[PDB]
Amino acid sequence: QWCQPGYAYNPVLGICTITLSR
C-alpha cells in the first residue's frame, strides 16, 4: 500500500490513483 508522488491512495479502489487537487 504505497503511492508514488502525485498519486493519492484510494481505499475504495484499493490502488493508487493520480490526483491534481485542482
Q: How large is the C-alpha radius of gyration of the chain?
A: 8
Write down the experimental method used for this entry.
Answer: NMR
In angstroms, the CA 22 to CA 11 distance is: 20
Contact call for residues 7 and 13 (beta carbons, < 8 A): no
SS3 16: strand
- Taking residue 3's Cβ as centre, other Cβ atoms within 10 Å add up to 14
Contact call for residues 21 and 7 (beta carbons, < 8 A): no
